[PDB]
Write a protein that binds this ligand. Sequence first.
Ligand SMILES: O=C(O)CCCC[C@@H]1SC[C@@H]2NC(=O)N[C@@H]21
Ligand SMILES: O=C(O)CCCC[C@@H]1SC[C@@H]2NC(=O)N[C@@H]21
Ligand SMILES: O=C(O)CCCC[C@@H]1SC[C@@H]2NC(=O)N[C@@H]21
Ligand SMILES: O=C(O)CCCC[C@@H]1SC[C@@H]2NC(=O)N[C@@H]21
Lengths: 117, 118, 118, 117
Amino acid sequence: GITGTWYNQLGSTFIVTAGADGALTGTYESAVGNAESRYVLTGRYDSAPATDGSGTALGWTVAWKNNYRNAHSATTWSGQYVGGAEARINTQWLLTSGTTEANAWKSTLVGHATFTK
Amino acid sequence: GITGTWYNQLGSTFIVTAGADGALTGTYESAVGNAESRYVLTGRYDSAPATDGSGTALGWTVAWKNNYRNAHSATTWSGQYVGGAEARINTQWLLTSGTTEANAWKSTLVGHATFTKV
Amino acid sequence: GITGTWYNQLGSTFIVTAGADGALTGTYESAVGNAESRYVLTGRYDSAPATDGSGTALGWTVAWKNNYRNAHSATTWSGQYVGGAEARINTQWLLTSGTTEANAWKSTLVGHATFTKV
Amino acid sequence: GITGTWYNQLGSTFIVTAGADGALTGTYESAVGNAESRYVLTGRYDSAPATDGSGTALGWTVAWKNNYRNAHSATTWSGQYVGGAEARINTQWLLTSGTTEANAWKSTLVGHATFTK
Ligand SMILES: O=C(O)CCCC[C@@H]1SC[C@@H]2NC(=O)N[C@@H]21
Ligand SMILES: O=C(O)CCCC[C@@H]1SC[C@@H]2NC(=O)N[C@@H]21
Ligand SMILES: O=C(O)CCCC[C@@H]1SC[C@@H]2NC(=O)N[C@@H]21
Ligand SMILES: O=C(O)CCCC[C@@H]1SC[C@@H]2NC(=O)N[C@@H]21
């Protein structure tokens, strides 16, 4: 289902394991930004979705600090999984960077992304 | 810093532990919506912030299924921690519900919130 | 550039004129939600863009009251125009409904949309 | 009601006239950003709100080009007006700047603001 290797249009990649648990654990690699190599991810999802043909709700977080680099920032993704012969995940995202109290009005970016398996 | 008990002015509350490894682990109790009791939370944060006076970036997720009910929905929170005499967490949030293909245009709310400690 | 007729893949459509004075003026017809017929639109855009290959920034608003019905709600669209052989407008949107003080936490949806011309 | 002079916590100011019309027209001055002096604004609002004690829906747009400066960007505000002895307007905002197709993933900021009269 959700478990496996997914891609986006920018060329970023992410690998996940989805547990019975309702938990999401894995790594993310960004093709853009002040980022190099792989980063740790964690999240949650609805493990008992409805039957009516609606999608499956989920979300996950990434902080941009690893052994090579630290951007002093973090992104969260919110969306849903749609299954079938051509599975996808549709999301919207927020990225916050640390700032002074003075610069806080410009700390946060918003965008959206589709991943496919 | 972050480790402790926090609240927002809706009356919602959460408890968290921040580790040296960059994780966030705890549980959340909502005062509004289709929810009762405690729900699992997980996330990440910047464990080595700049020292120029800027805040510490973080995020976390909750999915609204526990032993008592399932709302078929999830929320993510994005923002930063600001410490000192009056420590706060300032965030923006996204809530997504599972909808059919036709109704996806109205599946996601956006909002903001300030939490205060102790 | 912008002046003309545009659509999104929900089937919604709008007509607009962009003036030398920086205004946007037209009307919008929605294919979904609590809406029938045409609604008034107004906005602004960058009338003197950079020439490095970047897009042209703009925005517009619609309030969902006309002669036939009133939904007690409004939407704003924020984004940019990209011209050439295949011209597009790429946006993100906010829809706010009038709620009581208690329900304000769930008054606003967020979404995105790409429009295509002619 | 909505007509008059409003302020925010940053020290930005805006003056509006709200017509029978359902229209919003005025100017905005920013205390932050790549901005100097006053800018033209336009928008719409619900001129026949419900009676139940819910607020009044509205929105407005600003492009950051005037006779002194041009930032190549625009902000839109979405929210509602709440009347009484202590009137306010509560909103959320999006700011887009022009970018290349390559840099589009970071074109848009999001935040929120309360104004009082
Ligand atoms: O520059 C930073 O602050 C760190 C890299 C940010 C990467 C972002 S997260 C949203 C978007 N989607 C991606 O795959 N990468 C960028
Ligand atoms: O109704 C649901 O779908 C689940 C409960 C949602 C609770 C929300 S999350 C945003 C807001 N902030 C809170 O503390 N509670 C509500
Ligand atoms: O139902 C309402 O409150 C008024 C109609 C809303 C229509 C929305 S605006 C976002 C989305 N894009 C469209 O073209 N139509 C819907
Ligand atoms: O720097 C720019 O691109 C132009 C100035 C941006 C001003 C923004 S709009 C959101 C926020 N609220 C304000 O009063 N000012 C800033």
